Symmetry: C6
């Protein structure tokens, strides 16, 4: 059954006993509750692995994908229990890493998690990403362009669809790039850190990173945190401290790169 | 034309029967014709069937007369869905980016993609004067003080965001070159955390959402905008605007300073 | 002419929502125009305005008429009391309108209908310059009482709705009316600031008031001190000029600059 | 004279809303004046004021009278408890008034009714200069206890309503009353800041208090330190002078400058 | 004497509103004083205070007295639970009072009743200077546990109401009581900042606490670090001095300056102005 | 040992308010201690802690024990679900306590019970220095996954209550436990900033956690980067030292300074 969209009562014992999917507080063994800013989210990891295996097994993955877009959307959802995060203050996602879940991205053994590609509007993030020959590009919160006509570009509307689609394809062993996390930068607000960027963005990036790590996948996402010019280095350090990997691009070329690999953390750099 | 009147009574988000209703009826269940989106924290719905039906009646009519007679019916084209907390299942909702070589437009270049083209500049930039020199078919007037220009039959006055967007989408669908003077109320009304230049970053997301709803509907809208950036960060704010829409023209002294367009044959840059 | 409802109207009851704006619902009558200043919803009723302006013309004594009809004029401009009344009209402005047949003799012979603002800092002499333009009536709002208030031609008001109703009634009755001042609009319409630290909601409020005057074919004149930071005065004054039918900058009770949208185009002086 | 309602009044029930402001509704009695200081709604009842001031005059012993009548003075100035009581009166100020028949002997023989504020930073000696003007009573509000509070002529008050009721009663009873001080108004009336980091709502509050005093034909004198940033003190003092009937700047317990709205026009010194 | 209501009282029900402040209503008994610190409403009950302070004076074991009577002590200072309880008293301060009949031997022989604050930055030596003044008891609030908590005459407290009730009981029982410290008041009383960077609500809170002490004829001593920016320390310290009966500025566990409102006038030293 | 209620408890119903904190009311049982971090109310139950710590001691395999008892440990530290539960305890801290009978061998032989924080900026090597102190278990919280998470001696946690319950259970079971890190406390405990732009509520939260550990006679060690502005690092570190039982400043995975509240007085690296 589809996740409930009716708001679940937080004062009724019968409502609260139901699963997160069904508007209650009780997580099923397949459900992982997490948060991005004040937004609660659930990923159904077991439904995710099953849908990805079905996609891989299908006669035509492109046809299967179109035919099952609603089932896929149900993999990541906002649980609708009222005040659902009330029992889990300062909710992050359990940090995990395995030498048995590494990925060929920039280095042969990148840990599972999130790799962000950072730079301003003239950085050439999309150009550099296209040159890394990904299998699919998830297009989110960006203006429509000729690139969207490609079969390998998948358009999504909200955060839950973006995550459901990207996690599905990454689980199915596609190299997934998300263009972009613009709406996360714009939407995840609150107290700013010494760089001028909301600290809830760093916590959100670690939450998304650790959901990818738990699911043994790698997601690559473009992001422009729009730091003030005097604090760019601090903001970029805070982003690197939140995720499995980070590439800074300028003129569609790598300025710096840092990755948490199966054999240790590495750092590279080349001034523009 | 038979179009429903969207509900204005607030719909309950805790009652299963209310939530099961369509977006036009105060619930959460989108009909095949309904597209839910957001501009800032404002939820909106465009109804594709009300749009195609009413655009056909507009084509068959005299826009000024038609819009006066059908003012009540156009509320069905773009409306705020009145379900309580309607965006709760769709956090950070944008509009799916789309483009087609079969939906291109003759504006500045022969093959401008569907979307939004913004004309940018400060108070003395001459945005209105440059726009009038591009000889549009209709100018929608929104959020600006009354001027002699408002007496013209080709100027249609609107009051809120939903009326502005419904009139614009209907005219563009009916093949009119429509210009909006202006998006001042979007600059003033879409608030939140500021990025560079002191401009709310939610404005850039708002522009992308409007751009992509136009792209989905295969139309091009043109709009004047003054983002009121601080003087030291104008170039950065204008770059952020260009990164949000199908096209942007920077005007000064009612002349083009620079122009950038997403066309069917790639990105075009001038100036 | 009846009093608008002050009981809050339910936004979840269909019978309450179907009612007119004056009756606590959402349905505008043909005579009602819903608009907003900041987060404050307002309605002007064109029929209450025309009917009561005729009663004011018949009295030929504004000072006495306004004291006696304090209750009735609430029908002309009021806050509609439907809960969340602006929910169907996001980013609500007022339709821009102008006509060569609704022009006014103020500074130029053919000033468009709308709002003319007189701008300057504390000590600029806005009141003194205004008095020298020999208006017929001065509406006194949000200013400390002074000897000027004893004059029969000074009409005191308390809130925004009374100020606007009195102003629109006097202007419709063909009086040259000046409002001293829009201090409370500067102080009360706040939110995200643009340059100078002035709330951009103030510019939207001035355009909304301007366009209601334009729709009603009247001209209102108001003194305003936006209290911009000293480094951004020129920018704030340009933003104010971009919001209304006309603007006069005063210093030492003399014109520094003036810009007007007239029936024959934009006029700039100084 | 009866106690105002303290139960919150429903804003959605017609029977509750029809009640007077003292009874938790929205309908002002002829004796009630609704006004606001910041977001705080207030009512002054003219009949409770005139009745109780006559009782105070008859006692000829303010210190004793105020202790015995503490409960009754709640009727003079109170917060009306109707829910969302200011909803029909956005940006509510108080009608500016002046009369040559209500002038006062304070610094000049014909000071208009209103509020006179005494300004100065720390160590200015606002209290020392004020005590040298030989007031009849000093109301003590929001200040730490001092040997001065032992004096029979010092009357301690706790909140804004008690301070205003005691002040209006004493002034109506023809006492020269000084308020030490408006510190809690500076601290409590918050919002968007103007120059100097001073909330512009403070200027509107001072004009509202000034105009209530002017309507009631009394003069109140109050010490205030708006705590402006050092670079903008002159601008903040200009904004205060523009908000009230009179203002004195003190240093070393001496007058540095003074400006008053008098029955014969504005008077300026230094 | 009994613990106050913790059930929230209705503000729309006439019967609930008619009840005393301790019983969840709005009607102050003659023994109740309503005041506020920031947005926190508080009530001190003079009868619970006088009754329990007399019991503390008579106690053969004061340390056990505080633990044994912890439930009754909630009656002395409490948050009244009427909904929107401050609605009829906007900008509520506490009536300023002073008496030559209620003076105290602290730094000077005739300190007025009120609050004396000891001010200084992190590492100023406020605790060390206070301990050198040989107080009878130290209330420990919002500070990390230290050897002091086991070795000296001290009483550990958890929240603002317990801190104030314990302080008022000890001072009424004629103890020289010091509070280490008011850091949770500095951290918790927020809002619009003064030209100093410090919330002006902190100054109003200090005057409210000062005047409750003055009304009850007691003197409380408290350490405070307002955490002013370095360029505005002098302004913040002046605003604090203008809010209370006395203030001592300490640096390197020594008096830098002191100002006190005494029964015979202001007594001060080391002042830069 | 039963699960605390997650249904929100009424604050206007006398029967609901009379219930224990675990059961959604306001009445603390003799075993319950109510405290707060920021606006977050918390309860530690001393009987759930001693009962489950005894079960953990008996298992002698923390990783396996924590997987099997994940539901039970919710009784040790939980958010009480009574509505407005902190309403009778404004500015709630935790009673400061110390005892010569509850000292710990950490850096010095007699460190008082409480919290010891390890501070340093990005690249300071806090985790590396901590690992070199050979702790028995490292709790991993609010940090990106790393090769270190593969170790059996690393236990991953998700929220503040799980982090504190796991830490208190391990310390009560006589494990030297280190927490990597308090990054989510730095991000999550917001409000008015003091010097360096650090929220002063962070200092109060560190004292509350310190004093809960002191009351329970345990020592917890945690890494923290308070992310002060560069000009006020020294002041922020002094404010942190003033809030807890001990603090170590690390740079290049080496001690630059250390201060500890010991059973025999304050110990400083300045000596």
């Amino acid at each position: 059954a589809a996740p409930a969209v009716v708001e679940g009562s937080s004062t009724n014992a019968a409502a609260v006993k139901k699963s997160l999917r069904d508007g209650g507080m009780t997580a099923l063994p397949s459900e992982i509750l997490f948060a991005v800013g004040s937004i609660p989210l659930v990923v159904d990891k077991d439904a995710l692995s099953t849908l990805a295996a079905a996609l891989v097994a299908s006669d035509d993955p492109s046809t299967w994908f179109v035919a099952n877009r609603e089932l896929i959307r149900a993999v990541v959802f906002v649980p609708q229990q009222n005040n659902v995060l009330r029992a889990t203050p300062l909710l992050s996602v359990r940090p995990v890493a395995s030498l048995s879940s590494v990925h060929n991205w920039q280095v042969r053994n990148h840990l599972s998690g999130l790799h962000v590609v950072v730079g301003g509007t003239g950085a050439g993030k999309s150009k550099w990403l296209n040159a890394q020959t990904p299998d699919v590009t998830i297009r989110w919160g960006e203006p429509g362009e000729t690139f969207d006509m490609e079969e390998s570009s998948i358009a999504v509307a909200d955060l839950t669809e973006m995550l459901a689609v990207a996690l599905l394809l990454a689980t199915a062993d596609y190299r997934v790039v998300i263009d972009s996390f613009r709406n996360l930068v714009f939407g995840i607000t609150g107290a700013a850190g010494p760089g001028g960027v909301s600290v809830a963005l760093y916590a959100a990036l670690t939450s998304l990173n650790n959901i990818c790590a738990e699911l043994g996948v790698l997601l690559v996402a473009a992001i422009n945190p729009m730091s003030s010019d005097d604090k760019v280095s601090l903001v970029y350090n805070n982003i690197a401290a939140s995720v499995a990997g980070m590439t800074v691009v300028n003129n569609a070329a790598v300025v710096s790169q840092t990755i948490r690999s199966g054999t240790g953390r590495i750092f590279s750099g080349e001034p523009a």
